[PDB]
C-alpha cells in the first residue's frame, strides 16, 4: 500500500542510521544520530526503542522493520484504545470529555512536561466548545491519522 | 474505606504513564502540523535533505511505542 517512492524515503532515513551499511541500526547507530540533533538518551532508553520493533531479537532493527514501524505510526487499533485509555485516567466523569483546565494541567505538570507552547499549540488544536470541555474521542481520531 | 484508599494509589500510579503516553503522542503527531516546522529554515532544510525530519519522526514513534507500552504494564 505503499509507494515506491515513499519507501526510497524511508530507505533514505534508514541508512542515515545505518551508518556502516550492514542493513542493521544498532544502539550505537541509533543514539550517535540522535545526539548529534542534540537528543541525550540513555543507553537503557535505546534498549527500549530497539526492542519494540526488533521482531528478531538480536537487539538490532533491520529494514523491514523500520519500513513497518515508519508506515504504521500511531493509525493502529492498539494505539487508539491505548491512548483513549490514557485520557481516561484523567476522567473522573467518565463521560469521554476532559476540562481544557485539567489537561493543560495534566501535560504541563506529569511525565514529560510540556513547555507552555507545547500545551498551547495541543489546546488549539481540539475545539472546546461551552464550558471548555474537549471532546478527546475526537482528538485521539485526529492524532490516529 | 482501606479498600477504597489503596484502588487509589494504584489509580495514582498510571497517572504519570498516562501523561507520557499523551505527551509522546502529541509530539509524534506535532511532527507534521507544529508551528516548530513551519520556518523558512526548515522547508529549505526538508528540501536539500527530507531525511532529518523523517529521522526525527523515526525517534518519536520509537518513543511513541516505548510510552504505550509502559502505560499498557500498569494495567
Ligand atoms: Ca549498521
Redesign the interface.
Known sequence: QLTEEQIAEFKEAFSLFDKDGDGTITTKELGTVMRSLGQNPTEAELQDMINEVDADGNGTIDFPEFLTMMARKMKDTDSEEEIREAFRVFDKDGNGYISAAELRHVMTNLGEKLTDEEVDEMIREADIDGDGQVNYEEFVQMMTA | KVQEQHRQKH?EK?????????????????TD???AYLTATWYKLDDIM???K??????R??????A??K??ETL
Open positions: 489509580f498510571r497517572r504519570m504513564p498516562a501523561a507520557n503516553l499523551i505527551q509522546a503522542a502529541w509530539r509524534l503527531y506535532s502540523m507544529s508551528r527530507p531525511a532529518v523523517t529521522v526525527i519522526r523515526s525517534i514513534i520509537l518513543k511513541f511505542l516505548v504505550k507500552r502505560f499498557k
